[PDB]
Amino acid sequence: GPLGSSMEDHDDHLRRKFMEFPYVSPTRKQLMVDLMSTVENRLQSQLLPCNLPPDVRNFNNPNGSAEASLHIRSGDKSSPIDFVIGSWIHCKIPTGVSLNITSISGFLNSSTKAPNFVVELIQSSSKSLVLILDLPHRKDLVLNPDYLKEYYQDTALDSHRQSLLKLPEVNPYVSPSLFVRSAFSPTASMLKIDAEEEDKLEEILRDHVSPAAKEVLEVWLERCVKIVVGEEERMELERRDKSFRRKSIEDDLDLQFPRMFGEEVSSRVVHAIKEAFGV
Amino acid sequence: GPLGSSMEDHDDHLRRKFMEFPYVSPTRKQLMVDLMSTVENRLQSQLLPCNLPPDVRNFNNPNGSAEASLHIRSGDKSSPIDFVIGSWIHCSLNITSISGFLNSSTKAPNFVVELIQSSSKSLVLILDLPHRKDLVLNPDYLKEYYQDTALDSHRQSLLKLPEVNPYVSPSLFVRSAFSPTASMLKIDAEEEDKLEEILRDHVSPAAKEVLEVWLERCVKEEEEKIVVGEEERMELERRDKSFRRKSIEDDLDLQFPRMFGEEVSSRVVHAIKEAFGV
Ligand code: NA
Ligand code: NA
């Protein structure tokens, strides 16, 4: 290009579609762009290139009802990072209620025991947007009062949830899944945001959700990603990490995907994603 | 007396002093009485007599502003039960509660019900079977004790009520230590009559049903079922100790002098920690 090499360099271009975030608002794709850019800019020296086949990075329902994009960058041999994953999912089928999901998860390996990172924006309905924003814990918080103190007390993580909840439009979200409730830290922002007034929703996303998410990511990068872990704790951590991932993707990959993308697309991608997700 | 020993036995005497629940609503006293008596009546054969000093079991600010009473029964040698602890604190401030704490011979959930009144226009209920194993690392623990038991239905039901809102603790320790199905609820006392209604007709059956799941599904031994080995017991003992310690330590170190005085406090808080095994 005149101003650069995005449309020339293959790596940059493989994520161009991912970063397009076609099916969401300006404010929503802007948050996600900024978040994914920080992740990759900040961790570029320890992240392997995306090796997902083009076939798995972008896929769709041939009937045009559903479209997804996935961007995964594994950590290098010496990284505390296992992998980071950006995703978006679009499904507009039934009477016309279009499901939209944008998310970024960061997952640490055994060599550290520090918290993971998660943001998810999910709009299935039209009266509601769900925000999941957390640094989920990788150690039992009652057995380890010190872990709780340095990752959740010292870090003022709960200020972000208390802040967002003050808004009249923002109620607590309660997962029907007990695993979800257990897997997320006591400072997790699990929130429902009223969605039926685009101009106000947009204002809440840009003035409130965005600073909050950027600051949470800021502590993940600064206090979690930036003593050794012994072999007994390593196996504990790996058993725990594998449950959390499996359980987090299983029903979606196995039940939701064949519906959304037809069977042919599911059969092509589902295994490859479980592969990529270590499960 | 002609049909009993309660006016004649010392331990039976100052166990009734507890059961009086003097500073609380008539329906609150009944809940506590039914619950505390259900625990001791179903677990009679496993529970040791209250082995605890008399001036520990009951006390008061000598200036008469505070009043507290504690009933504590240790499990016997072969019991899964560590101790059970019913209590009331008046000082306004009305706390009634019944905690069940299991030991390391079993990994099964504990039991807690607290009713904390620290402002009118509200009542805090905490009703849980607190987990004793990490729920993500032990999904089968999550299943047996929370999913299979339908414990969440109590939380969901109560919360339908327009007077009943969720309660989010200031402590991140209590958020982590209570199960995903825990009823952490704020009930708004618009007026005593509506509050009473909720207590009698909603809280009471929920607490009883949760207790029933405890007794029958948590403390009741399974058939040829296994022993807690090597020392997952070491894990269990460390988790329990910290849980019990954070359950009382700031109350015992700051609220107790603040409330009862200084020497009554001094005479009482050590015996507590000891009784609580922290
Ligand atoms: Na609100
Ligand atoms: Na309610």
Side-chain angles (χ1 to χ4, degrees), chain A residues 1-15 17-76 78-91 94 96 98-126 128-197 200-227 229-279, chain B residues 1-9 11-16 18-19 21-51 53-59 61-76 78-120 122-185 187-191 193-221 225-226 228-229 231-257 259-266 268-273 275-278:
Chain A
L3 293 317
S5 69
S6 294
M7 301 284 276
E8 280 74 40
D9 188 76
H10 67 288
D11 274 11
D12 278 344
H13 192 269
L14 80 82
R15 91 192 220 280
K17 185 38 169 192
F18 170 74
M19 305 284 286
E20 202 198 348
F21 296 93
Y23 303 104
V24 303
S25 76
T27 299
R28 190 144 158 239
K29 92 164 269 200
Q30 191 56 71
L31 176 62
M32 297 303 301
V33 167
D34 286 344
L35 258 28
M36 199 72 216
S37 299
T38 310
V39 161
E40 305 186 77
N41 289 348
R42 197 76 85 72
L43 305 178
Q44 65 182 313
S45 63
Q46 51 169 132
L47 262 44
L48 269 23
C50 190
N51 52 58
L52 272 190
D55 186 84
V56 184
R57 302 188 327 257
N58 306 267
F59 51 95
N60 51 86
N61 195 329
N63 63 201
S65 60
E67 173 158 14
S69 189
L70 267 56
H71 182 75
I72 310 177
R73 301 265 301 269
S74 165
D76 69 22
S78 50
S79 187
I81 295 141
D82 191 330
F83 67 103
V84 292
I85 183 188
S87 62
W88 56 257
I89 310 277
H90 179 76
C91 191
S98 78
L99 167 74
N100 287 114
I101 305 176
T102 54
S103 85
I104 301 151
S105 300
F107 294 99
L108 299 186
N109 56 33
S110 348
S111 59
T112 184
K113 63 195 172 156
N116 285 333
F117 166 87
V118 173
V119 217
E120 310 190 334
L121 290 306
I122 301 90
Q123 212 195 136
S124 37
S125 329
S126 79
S128 292
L129 215 216
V130 177
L131 168 61
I132 301 278
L133 177 64
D134 190 42
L135 262 37
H137 50 288
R138 293 176 58 235
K139 276 252 131 201
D140 174 310
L141 265 14
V142 180
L143 272 183
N144 303 284
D146 54 307
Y147 190 100
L148 174 73
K149 175 173 206 287
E150 67 156 313
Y151 292 119
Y152 305 96
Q153 270 292 121
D154 294 340
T155 59
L157 274 177
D158 197 61
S159 60
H160 304 304
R161 176 193 142 272
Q162 302 178 328
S163 204
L164 268 18
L165 217 32
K166 263 166 180 282
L167 300 169
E169 300 82 12
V170 170
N171 313 101
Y173 167 74
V174 45
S175 190
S177 164
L178 310 191
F179 170 84
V180 174
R181 302 194 205 153
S182 318
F184 286 79
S185 88
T187 63
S189 298
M190 314 273 290
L191 300 171
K192 207 150 206 144
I193 305 175
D194 293 324
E196 65 298 279
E197 309 136 312
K200 184 57 185 200
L201 181 75
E202 219 73 330
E203 169 208 289
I204 293 160
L205 288 166
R206 71 154 152 84
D207 298 352
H208 296 275
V209 171
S210 288
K214 295 208 190 93
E215 295 186 16
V216 176
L217 175 60
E218 222 38 72
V219 12
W220 191 64
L221 293 170
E222 293 303 301
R223 324 278 275 283
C224 311
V225 172
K226 189 209 281 158
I227 299 96
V229 175
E231 215 59 24
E232 305 290 15
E233 206 178 29
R234 267 171 144 81
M235 300 165 325
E236 171 193 77
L237 288 171
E238 288 164 8
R239 185 185 283 104
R240 192 191 220 277
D241 291 339
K242 194 146 152 25
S243 276
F244 173 93
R245 291 189 204 104
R246 193 179 57 238
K247 265 261 159 177
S248 292
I249 62 163
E250 266 196 317
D251 286 356
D252 288 318
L253 287 188
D254 279 322
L255 272 14
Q256 269 206 347
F257 258 51
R259 178 218 292 139
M260 287 190 296
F261 303 110
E263 199 85 19
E264 286 84 340
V265 173
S266 301
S267 79
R268 192 180 68 233
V269 304
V270 162
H271 178 85
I273 300 156
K274 284 173 185 189
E275 149 221 287
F277 251 96
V279 303
Chain B
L3 48 272
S5 132
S6 66
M7 297 287 98
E8 326 304 340
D9 196 80
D11 183 76
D12 207 338
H13 181 69
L14 76 178
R15 109 93 172 171
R16 153 204 34 274
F18 167 67
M19 300 292 301
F21 291 90
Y23 300 95
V24 303
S25 135
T27 317
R28 254 179 76 174
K29 172 183 176 174
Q30 250 289 111
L31 213 219
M32 299 307 302
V33 167
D34 288 353
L35 249 37
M36 189 70 259
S37 106
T38 295
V39 156
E40 301 176 294
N41 295 184
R42 284 255 248 110
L43 293 181
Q44 257 196 304
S45 90
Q46 283 181 37
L47 271 28
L48 260 31
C50 187
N51 195 8
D55 80 304
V56 157
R57 306 164 73 127
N58 293 276
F59 61 116
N61 185 327
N63 75 63
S65 84
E67 323 80 357
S69 194
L70 320 173
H71 193 54
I72 299 160
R73 319 265 308 271
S74 290
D76 66 37
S78 42
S79 180
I81 289 282
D82 186 346
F83 63 98
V84 185
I85 159 110
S87 84
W88 64 261
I89 274 83
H90 173 248
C91 176
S92 47
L93 211 218
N94 305 106
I95 286 166
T96 39
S97 66
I98 308 173
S99 289
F101 291 101
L102 305 184
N103 61 51
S104 19
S105 64
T106 174
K107 64 231 263 79
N110 283 341
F111 174 75
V112 181
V113 64
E114 284 152 15
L115 293 138
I116 290 151
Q117 212 174 72
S118 265
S119 51
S120 194
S122 275
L123 180 86
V124 161
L125 167 74
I126 289 158
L127 210 220
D128 198 22
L129 264 30
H131 57 293
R132 282 173 65 228
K133 290 224 66 68
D134 174 285
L135 269 13
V136 178
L137 267 174
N138 304 268
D140 272 11
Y141 193 98
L142 184 70
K143 191 193 152 65
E144 183 179 351
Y145 296 116
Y146 306 98
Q147 329 210 242
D148 288 359
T149 54
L151 274 189
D152 211 31
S153 65
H154 306 292
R155 182 207 140 276
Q156 296 182 44
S157 160
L158 267 20
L159 215 23
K160 251 174 171 43
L161 309 180
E163 301 78 5
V164 180
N165 289 283
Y167 158 84
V168 177
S169 175
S171 171
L172 304 185
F173 170 84
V174 341
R175 304 196 208 160
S176 316
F178 284 85
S179 86
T181 63
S183 284
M184 226 90 58
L185 300 171
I187 320 164
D188 55 41
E190 346 172 352
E191 268 133 30
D193 67 8
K194 194 54 166 169
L195 192 69
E196 285 304 281
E197 188 180 315
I198 294 175
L199 290 155
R200 191 174 43 86
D201 291 342
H202 287 85
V203 170
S204 302
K208 292 169 159 56
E209 196 30 66
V210 171
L211 183 61
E212 279 296 311
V213 161
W214 189 57
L215 296 164
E216 291 295 308
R217 300 238 225 182
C218 302
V219 15
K220 179 223 192 81
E221 56 158 329
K225 256 220 78 277
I226 55 83
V228 186
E231 265 192 338
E232 178 171 29
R233 298 212 179 189
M234 183 152 270
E235 188 200 81
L236 295 175
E237 285 145 46
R238 210 193 341 148
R239 210 187 176 276
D240 296 334
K241 209 164 181 200
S242 316
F243 178 89
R244 284 185 266 100
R245 210 184 297 239
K246 288 245 56 81
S247 291
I248 63 181
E249 261 200 321
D250 302 293
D251 289 320
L252 279 181
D253 289 351
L254 310 167
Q255 274 205 344
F256 263 41
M259 212 146 65
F260 300 88
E262 202 51 73
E263 193 41 74
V264 54
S265 190
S266 297
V268 85
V269 328
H270 172 266
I272 322 277
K273 301 206 201 208
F276 262 78
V278 300

Short mmCIF file of all heavy atoms in Angstrom, two decimals, chain B residues 108-138, unseen atoms left out:
data_model
loop_
_atom_site.label_atom_id
_atom_site.label_comp_id
_atom_site.label_asym_id
_atom_site.label_seq_id
_atom_site.Cartn_x
_atom_site.Cartn_y
_atom_site.Cartn_z
N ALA B 108 -17.08 -33.86 52.26
CA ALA B 108 -18.42 -33.35 51.91
C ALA B 108 -18.64 -31.90 52.39
O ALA B 108 -17.99 -31.45 53.33
CB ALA B 108 -19.49 -34.28 52.48
N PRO B 109 -19.58 -31.16 51.73
CA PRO B 109 -19.83 -29.74 52.03
C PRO B 109 -20.21 -29.49 53.48
O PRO B 109 -20.81 -30.35 54.13
CB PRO B 109 -21.03 -29.42 51.15
CG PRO B 109 -20.91 -30.34 50.02
CD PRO B 109 -20.48 -31.63 50.67
N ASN B 110 -19.83 -28.31 53.96
CA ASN B 110 -20.35 -27.75 55.20
C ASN B 110 -21.82 -27.23 55.10
O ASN B 110 -22.51 -27.44 54.11
CB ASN B 110 -19.41 -26.62 55.64
CG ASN B 110 -18.10 -27.13 56.28
OD1 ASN B 110 -18.00 -28.28 56.72
ND2 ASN B 110 -17.13 -26.26 56.35
N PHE B 111 -22.27 -26.56 56.16
CA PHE B 111 -23.61 -25.99 56.25
C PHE B 111 -23.53 -24.64 56.92
O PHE B 111 -22.81 -24.49 57.90
CB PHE B 111 -24.53 -26.90 57.08
CG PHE B 111 -25.89 -26.33 57.34
CD1 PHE B 111 -26.86 -26.30 56.33
CD2 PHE B 111 -26.22 -25.83 58.59
CE1 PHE B 111 -28.10 -25.77 56.54
CE2 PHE B 111 -27.47 -25.30 58.83
CZ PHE B 111 -28.41 -25.26 57.79
N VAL B 112 -24.27 -23.67 56.39
CA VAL B 112 -24.34 -22.33 56.96
C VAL B 112 -25.72 -21.73 56.69
O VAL B 112 -26.25 -21.82 55.58
CB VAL B 112 -23.26 -21.37 56.38
CG1 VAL B 112 -23.34 -19.98 57.02
CG2 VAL B 112 -21.87 -21.93 56.52
N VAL B 113 -26.31 -21.17 57.73
CA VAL B 113 -27.40 -20.25 57.60
C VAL B 113 -27.14 -19.11 58.57
O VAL B 113 -26.91 -19.35 59.76
CB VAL B 113 -28.76 -20.93 57.87
CG1 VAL B 113 -28.87 -21.42 59.33
CG2 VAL B 113 -29.91 -19.97 57.47
N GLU B 114 -27.11 -17.88 58.06
CA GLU B 114 -27.01 -16.71 58.90
C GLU B 114 -28.15 -15.77 58.55
O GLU B 114 -28.50 -15.59 57.39
CB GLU B 114 -25.68 -15.98 58.69
CG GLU B 114 -24.47 -16.65 59.33
CD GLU B 114 -23.14 -16.37 58.60
OE1 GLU B 114 -23.07 -15.43 57.76
OE2 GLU B 114 -22.16 -17.10 58.88
N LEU B 115 -28.75 -15.18 59.58
CA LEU B 115 -29.65 -14.06 59.36
C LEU B 115 -29.03 -12.92 60.11
O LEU B 115 -28.85 -12.98 61.32
CB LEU B 115 -31.07 -14.36 59.86
CG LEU B 115 -31.81 -15.45 59.06
CD1 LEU B 115 -32.57 -16.42 59.95
CD2 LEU B 115 -32.69 -14.82 58.01
N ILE B 116 -28.64 -11.90 59.36
CA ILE B 116 -27.95 -10.74 59.90
C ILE B 116 -28.82 -9.50 59.66
O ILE B 116 -29.12 -9.16 58.52
CB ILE B 116 -26.53 -10.60 59.29
CG1 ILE B 116 -25.62 -11.72 59.81
CG2 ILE B 116 -25.91 -9.24 59.61
CD1 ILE B 116 -24.52 -12.15 58.86
N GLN B 117 -29.23 -8.87 60.74
CA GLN B 117 -30.00 -7.63 60.68
C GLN B 117 -29.15 -6.48 61.23
O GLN B 117 -28.88 -6.42 62.42
CB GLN B 117 -31.30 -7.77 61.48
CG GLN B 117 -32.49 -6.99 60.94
CD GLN B 117 -33.76 -7.31 61.71
OE1 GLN B 117 -33.92 -6.90 62.86
NE2 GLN B 117 -34.68 -8.04 61.07
N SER B 118 -28.70 -5.60 60.34
CA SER B 118 -27.81 -4.50 60.74
C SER B 118 -28.28 -3.15 60.24
O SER B 118 -27.49 -2.20 60.12
CB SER B 118 -26.37 -4.79 60.31
OG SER B 118 -25.66 -5.37 61.39
N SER B 119 -29.57 -3.06 59.97
CA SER B 119 -30.24 -1.84 59.54
C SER B 119 -31.66 -2.25 59.24
O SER B 119 -31.88 -3.30 58.65
CB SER B 119 -29.58 -1.25 58.28
OG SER B 119 -29.43 -2.22 57.24
N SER B 120 -32.65 -1.46 59.66
CA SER B 120 -33.99 -1.76 59.19
C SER B 120 -34.08 -1.35 57.73
O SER B 120 -33.24 -0.58 57.24
CB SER B 120 -35.09 -1.10 60.01
OG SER B 120 -36.33 -1.72 59.68
N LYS B 121 -35.09 -1.88 57.03
CA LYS B 121 -35.24 -1.73 55.59
C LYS B 121 -34.44 -2.82 54.90
O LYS B 121 -34.36 -2.85 53.66
CB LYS B 121 -34.79 -0.35 55.11
N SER B 122 -33.86 -3.71 55.71
CA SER B 122 -33.10 -4.86 55.21
C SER B 122 -32.83 -5.96 56.23
O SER B 122 -32.77 -5.73 57.45
CB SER B 122 -31.80 -4.42 54.53
OG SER B 122 -32.06 -4.08 53.18
N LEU B 123 -32.71 -7.17 55.69
CA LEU B 123 -32.23 -8.33 56.41
C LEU B 123 -31.34 -9.14 55.45
O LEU B 123 -31.72 -9.42 54.30
CB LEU B 123 -33.40 -9.19 56.88
CG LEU B 123 -33.00 -10.45 57.65
CD1 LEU B 123 -32.82 -10.12 59.10
CD2 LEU B 123 -34.04 -11.52 57.49
N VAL B 124 -30.16 -9.53 55.93
CA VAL B 124 -29.26 -10.33 55.12
C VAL B 124 -29.43 -11.80 55.46
O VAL B 124 -29.32 -12.20 56.61
CB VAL B 124 -27.79 -9.85 55.25
CG1 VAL B 124 -26.83 -10.92 54.79
CG2 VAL B 124 -27.60 -8.61 54.43
N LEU B 125 -29.75 -12.59 54.45
CA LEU B 125 -29.70 -14.03 54.60
C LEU B 125 -28.52 -14.61 53.84
O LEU B 125 -28.25 -14.25 52.69
CB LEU B 125 -31.00 -14.68 54.14
CG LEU B 125 -30.97 -16.20 53.96
CD1 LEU B 125 -30.97 -16.92 55.30
CD2 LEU B 125 -32.10 -16.67 53.06
N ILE B 126 -27.80 -15.51 54.50
CA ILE B 126 -26.81 -16.35 53.85
C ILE B 126 -27.16 -17.80 54.18
O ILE B 126 -27.12 -18.20 55.33
CB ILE B 126 -25.40 -16.02 54.34
CG1 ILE B 126 -24.99 -14.66 53.77
CG2 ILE B 126 -24.37 -17.13 53.90
CD1 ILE B 126 -23.91 -14.00 54.55
N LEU B 127 -27.50 -18.56 53.14
CA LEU B 127 -27.90 -19.94 53.25
C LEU B 127 -27.11 -20.75 52.19
O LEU B 127 -27.32 -20.56 50.99
CB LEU B 127 -29.40 -20.06 52.97
CG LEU B 127 -30.30 -21.12 53.59
CD1 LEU B 127 -31.22 -21.53 52.51
CD2 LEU B 127 -29.56 -22.33 54.13
N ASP B 128 -26.23 -21.64 52.65
CA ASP B 128 -25.32 -22.38 51.76
C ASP B 128 -24.91 -23.72 52.31
O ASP B 128 -24.93 -23.95 53.53
CB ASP B 128 -24.04 -21.58 51.43
CG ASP B 128 -23.30 -22.11 50.19
OD1 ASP B 128 -23.93 -22.79 49.33
OD2 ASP B 128 -22.09 -21.82 50.03
N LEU B 129 -24.53 -24.58 51.39
CA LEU B 129 -23.65 -25.72 51.69
C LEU B 129 -22.25 -25.40 51.14
O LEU B 129 -21.95 -25.74 50.01
CB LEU B 129 -24.20 -26.97 51.05
CG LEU B 129 -25.06 -27.90 51.91
CD1 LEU B 129 -25.87 -27.26 53.04
CD2 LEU B 129 -25.90 -28.81 51.04
N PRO B 130 -21.39 -24.71 51.92
CA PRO B 130 -20.07 -24.30 51.39
C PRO B 130 -19.22 -25.48 50.93
O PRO B 130 -19.03 -26.43 51.70
CB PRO B 130 -19.41 -23.59 52.57
CG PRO B 130 -20.51 -23.15 53.39
CD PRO B 130 -21.56 -24.25 53.30
N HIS B 131 -18.73 -25.42 49.69
CA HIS B 131 -17.91 -26.48 49.09
C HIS B 131 -16.57 -26.67 49.81
O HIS B 131 -16.00 -25.73 50.39
CB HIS B 131 -17.67 -26.20 47.61
CG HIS B 131 -17.03 -24.87 47.33
ND1 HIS B 131 -17.67 -23.67 47.56
CD2 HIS B 131 -15.82 -24.56 46.80
CE1 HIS B 131 -16.87 -22.68 47.21
NE2 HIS B 131 -15.75 -23.19 46.74
N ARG B 132 -16.08 -27.90 49.81
CA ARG B 132 -14.80 -28.12 50.47
C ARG B 132 -13.70 -28.57 49.51
O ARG B 132 -12.59 -28.88 49.93
CB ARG B 132 -14.95 -29.07 51.66
CG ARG B 132 -15.52 -28.36 52.86
CD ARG B 132 -15.85 -29.30 54.01
NE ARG B 132 -14.65 -29.94 54.56
CZ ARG B 132 -14.53 -31.25 54.80
NH1 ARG B 132 -15.55 -32.07 54.56
NH2 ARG B 132 -13.39 -31.74 55.29
N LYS B 133 -14.02 -28.56 48.23
CA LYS B 133 -13.10 -28.96 47.18
C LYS B 133 -13.22 -27.98 46.06
O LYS B 133 -14.30 -27.44 45.85
CB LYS B 133 -13.42 -30.39 46.71
CG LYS B 133 -13.07 -31.43 47.78
CD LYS B 133 -12.36 -32.64 47.21
CE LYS B 133 -10.99 -32.27 46.65
NZ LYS B 133 -10.10 -31.89 47.76
N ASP B 134 -12.12 -27.72 45.35
CA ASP B 134 -12.15 -26.79 44.22
C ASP B 134 -13.10 -27.37 43.19
O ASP B 134 -12.99 -28.55 42.81
CB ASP B 134 -10.76 -26.54 43.63
CG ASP B 134 -10.79 -25.69 42.36
OD1 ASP B 134 -11.18 -26.23 41.30
OD2 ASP B 134 -10.44 -24.48 42.40
N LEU B 135 -14.07 -26.55 42.77
CA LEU B 135 -15.18 -27.00 41.93
C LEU B 135 -14.81 -27.18 40.45
O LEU B 135 -15.48 -27.92 39.72
CB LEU B 135 -16.33 -26.02 42.07
CG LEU B 135 -17.43 -26.20 43.12
CD1 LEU B 135 -17.16 -27.21 44.19
CD2 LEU B 135 -17.69 -24.89 43.70
N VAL B 136 -13.78 -26.49 40.00
CA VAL B 136 -13.33 -26.62 38.62
C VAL B 136 -12.46 -27.87 38.48
O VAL B 136 -12.52 -28.55 37.47
CB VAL B 136 -12.55 -25.34 38.16
CG1 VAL B 136 -12.02 -25.48 36.72
CG2 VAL B 136 -13.43 -24.11 38.30
N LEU B 137 -11.65 -28.15 39.49
CA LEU B 137 -10.76 -29.31 39.55
C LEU B 137 -11.48 -30.60 39.93
O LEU B 137 -10.97 -31.70 39.68
CB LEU B 137 -9.70 -29.08 40.61
CG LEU B 137 -8.36 -28.48 40.27
CD1 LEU B 137 -7.67 -28.28 41.60
CD2 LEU B 137 -7.55 -29.42 39.38
N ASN B 138 -12.62 -30.45 40.60
CA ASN B 138 -13.46 -31.59 40.96
C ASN B 138 -14.88 -31.43 40.44
O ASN B 138 -15.78 -31.12 41.22
CB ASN B 138 -13.47 -31.80 42.46
CG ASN B 138 -12.08 -31.96 43.03
OD1 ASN B 138 -11.60 -33.09 43.15
ND2 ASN B 138 -11.42 -30.84 43.35
#
